[PDB]
Each structure stands twice: as structure tokens, then as C-alpha cells.
Amino acid sequence: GERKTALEMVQAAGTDRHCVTFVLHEEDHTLGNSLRYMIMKNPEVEFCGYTTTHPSESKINLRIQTRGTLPAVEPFQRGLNELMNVCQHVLDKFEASIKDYKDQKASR
Template identity: 35%
Template sequence: MNAPNRHELFVLDDGEKALEVSEDTKIPNAATFKIVKQDHTLGNMLRAQLLTSPVVLFAGYKTPHPLHPHFLLKIQTDGSMTPAAALEAAASRLIATLSSLEAKFRREFSFKDGETGGGAGGFNAGAGMGGEGDPYGSGGAAWGGASRDYLDF
């Protein structure tokens, strides 16, 4: 196949930098960042976070080719902050947002475990899948006696 090995898409090679910066000479207060071994997931989150800042005039990203594991992020600011500082601030805010999301996610699932009576995945030990062997749990016995849909965690 033409596709590279999976590990080559995420593991940095020896001496390879994760971030390369090139200042734009034609546009004031603009720079292009090449972020290596990442894809659309990080690119889109960084772009969205950058655009929430009032000092950022433009933020966009592109992946030049699907088989090349990097993307280019272009940032232009109003001059009160450098593009590198704007990227650093956006990355810090993104990390804080994701940490908050993770804490909320863990809290919600700890509540679900508490109300079902324990067990991995919220099932009672020995109760089986729905009591009668129903794979969708419509029997209610596996969910602490309450009648719930199989999509309820």
C-alpha cells in the first residue's frame, strides 16, 4: 500500500521538531506554523480557540496532503500580540477546556456508577444483561431495577 505505517503518523523521528514557525513577510503580524505528526483534530480545535481571541484577525489551517502527517496553521493578529504568543495562549486555554471537560465526564460517570450499585459499566454482578438474557437490557434488572433503555449508561 502507499499509506505509511501507523506509528509514523504520530511518533516524532530523532531530531524532528514538533513545531516549525515561518514569519510571513507580506502580511503584517502573521506567521505560518507547521505542526508535525498531528491531524485535523488538533488543527480544528486550535483554529476555533484562536478565533475566540479578540486580538486574532485570522486563523486557519490546512493539511497539504492526507498522507503527510502535518498541518499548516496560519495566524494573523492585530499587532498587540505576536502570532506565537496568540498560539501559546490558545493552546493553554484549550488544555484548560479539555481538562474541565474530562473532569465533568469523570464526575458524570462516577454518578452513574453510584446510582446503579457498582460494578464495571454499571451492571450488577450476577444480574446478567437484562435478567432474561436480553442484549438491550430492557428487563430492567441489570440497571438497578429501573426501566431504562440500552442507550442509558
């Protein structure tokens, strides 16, 4: 949707699909670090690292280098999905716990 508040991908020297650098705009260490943690769980990626280009700017660079087969854009799109699944589960669990505690406290 947004042509540049979001993704700009730079395929490496030789446009290796297995080595991509994603530029994520308007992002700081929050999403960078959580998404790097979620992408490291994939045994098909050999190098994942994020970095902020400069303090004045608001953008991060992820670097995903996967193994021989997959195009390194599936690891990214799967780390996103797993992180969103974890957030949904945490939200459900937290709301259920808050409700249970409110009941336990309002009864007594």
C-alpha cells in the same frame, strides 16, 4: 524537545511577527480544527486558518495573523492553554458524572 516532529515557524514576507505560519508535524484535522476553534475566540487575532499540506504527509499549517501589537505567537500559546483547560474540565466533569451514575445504579 523534538526538533521537527513539532513546530517549525515561517514568519511571512518581511518576517511579520503579526503573520506567522506554524507547521505542526504528526497532526491531522483533530488538533488542527480544535486549536483553530480555540484561537478564533481571541479578539486580538484577525485571521486564523489551518490546512493539511498533502494527504501523503502528516503535518498541518496554521496561519495566525494578529492585530498590530502582539506577535501572533501569544495567540497560539494561549489557544493551546485554553484548549487544555477545556479538556481538563471536561475530564473532571465526565469522571464525576460516571462515578455518580455508577453509585446511583449500584445502590438501586
